[model samples]
Target: GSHMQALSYREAVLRAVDRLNEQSSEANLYRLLELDQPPKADEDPGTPKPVSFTVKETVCPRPTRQPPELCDFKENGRVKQCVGTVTLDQIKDPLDITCNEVQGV
Candidate 1:
């Protein structure tokens, strides 16, 4: 059962990226380019009620300001990838999805 029929694979990933950007204290922010593959869900529907998916996202960095846009893929043709987890949080205002623990180069 897919609760995210309203959200596309790409959209969900972007949501995670946005969360990453907002949560990050770094000078660079990540922009999603592509996903390694489609995400698969892990749930039992046994009533703990949870949604967790591991999605590997390929992204490029943008500076806080100045110097064009993408920085030519991290200088001399290189890109980054992030491994993150997203889950539905009942603690959020009436339940919402949150992305956590994203580590990207």
Candidate 2:
């Protein structure tokens, strides 16, 4: 069963957004707008595996106090999407996130 958010998928989304945060300061934190893909037949969140998915989120001008609330962003937010390929097989830097925006965004 392909749930809305599988464990692996959730982790993928997390790290993808994390990379964004890594590139910016605390005040410029990003929030998820939506996730494009979920786990399919060949996927299972129960085991530590690797999967690639798309993450479309917004970069907030001012950090939000609360956790990203159901894909809502302020007017100051900007859209930036990323496709991250992550592998749990090696927790040692196994995340590959590619952003859709140009450099120095």
Candidate 3:
């Protein structure tokens, strides 16, 4: 008896996207967009491994958060208000991929 293996285009694309999202943070993804060549990897310490490469890019923004209130607020003839501060760092290239290698999971 013989068995056949097949993979769907949609499955491949989904797997690729999932893998990409898992490997890096939103911020890192943006950073990668600023590069031309793909990011480099460390030398293999032992045996070599099978690897695939592809160029993936997307128009996504970096993850961010808002400042939280420090204290509760009061109304009526009382005064009790707190202030908060938040800083947002600018993101450079906001479209890139860190890893293009496809693996069977």
Candidate 4:
């Protein structure tokens, strides 16, 4: 027998969006990705681990509290009013710093 594996970034984003819609604060809305895998037995002690991500605040329109609905941002200690739209095109590149080898076996 054989098995298959697949991954969809879009699906992942959709699932994340659904979860984010349930939160009431910025901390809840924030998404973090830890890409640093543990060092292998033979691996060097200091193999640089690269971390990268696309925060929801950076990609979608910020939540608003006036309506107080899905994607609404509450104005509390950690929650603030939404700011409309984040233009990814305007963002500078090299947002994530990487030091891993291009071709890994």
Top candidate when judged by lDDT against the true structure:
2
lDDT of 1 by residue, 2-84 (tens): 66332334444455555655555655554544455534533422222223333232233433442212333333222345554
Candidate 3, overall lDDT?
Answer: 0.26
Off by over 4 Å in 4: 1-7, 26-52, 56-105
Could you give candidate 3's per-residue lDDT for residues 2-93 as a string of tens digits?
44432222222233333444444643221111112112212221322122233223333323221111112222111111111111111121
TM-score ranking, best first = 2, 1, 3, 4
Which candidate leads in TM-score? 2
- Compose the digit string of candidate 4's lDDT tens values, residues 6-105: 2323323333333444443543443222222222312222332222223322222335431212343323313212211111212222222322322221
The residue-level lDDT of candidate 1 at 82 comes to 51
Which segments of candidate 1 are over 4 A away from where they belong? 1-5, 38-79, 87-105
lDDT of each: 0.41, 0.50, 0.26, 0.28
> What are the candidates' C-alpha RMSDs?
7.9, 6.2, 20.5, 16.0
Look at candidate 1 and give me any clashing residue pairs: none
Question: What's the C-alpha lDDT at position 6 in model 2?
Answer: 36
Model 4: which ten-residue window has the lowest total lDDT?
80-89
Return the lDDT, model 1, position 80: 48
Per candidate, the number of residue pairs that clash is 0, 0, 0, 0
